[PDB]
């Protein structure tokens, strides 16, 4: 839960690459998620009709929702762990309305790492992957604790 200053630097350095194309990264990540863990698609009434990766690729709505997710995640990561204010609304909606278990947040964490690895091999080597894994794990653990604080079992 305590990353080194160097680890946060590696996280924010590759995050800057994501920010050059937020929608493309977001669509790639959601498509990877739905492909790797298809049960997650069923949480989205707006996407559950999409039956193939190619259909997902053509979905402009999926690109927009990719921006929605990554915009929130980027703001969290930039806080370098001090993200209490940012997790409050996300925990509220994801625990009590969307009903997303923490395990699904683990699935999307794996998708994020997969997409970063594929799109940024030169800036996402072993050290950067380790750092991003720690940053996403911190996010998951803190949001799991916030679910519990709100009265819910993630
Ligand atoms: C990095 C992890 C995630 C982030 C930052 C994130 C962020 C967001 C944001 C900002 C919204 C819109 C505002 C809100 O309702 O809170 C949203 C909506 C939503 N999220 Fe997430 N989300 C994440 C992971 C997930 C996962 C893994 C699932 C399901 C597998 C999910 C399911 C949903 C659903 C169903 C909605 C509403 C969709 C709709 O209205 O059509 N989220 N998310």
UniProtKB/Swiss-Prot annotation:
It comes from Physeter macrocephalus (Sperm whale). It is an enzyme of class 1 (oxidoreductase). This is Myoglobin. Monomeric. Its EC number is 1.7.-.-, 1.11.1.-. PANTHER family: MYOGLOBIN (PTHR47132:SF1). Disulfide bonds: none annotated. Belongs to the globin family. Residues 2-148 form the Globin domain. One of its GO terms (molecular function) is oxygen binding. The lineage of its organism: Eukaryota, Metazoa, Chordata, Craniata, Vertebrata. Nitrite binds at residue 65.
């Amino acid at each position: 839960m305590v990353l080194s200053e160097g680890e946060w630097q590696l996280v924010l350095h590759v995050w800057a690459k994501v920010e050059a194309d937020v929608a493309g990264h977001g669509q790639d990540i959601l498509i990877r998620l739905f492909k790797s863990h298809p049960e997650t698609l069923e949480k989205f009434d707006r996407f559950k009709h999409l039956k193939t990766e190619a259909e997902m690729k053509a979905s402009e709505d999926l690109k927009k929702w990719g921006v929605t997710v990554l915009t929130a995640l980027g703001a969290i990561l930039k806080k370098k762990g001090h993200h209490e204010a940012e997790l409050k609304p996300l925990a509220q909606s994801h625990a009590t309305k969307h009903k997303i278990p923490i395990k699904y947040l683990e699935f999307i964490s794996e998708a994020i790492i997969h997409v970063l690895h594929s799109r940024h091999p030169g800036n996402f080597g072993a050290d950067a992957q380790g750092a991003m894994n720690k940053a996403l794990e911190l996010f998951r653990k803190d949001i799991a604790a916030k679910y519990k604080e709100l009265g819910y079992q993630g």
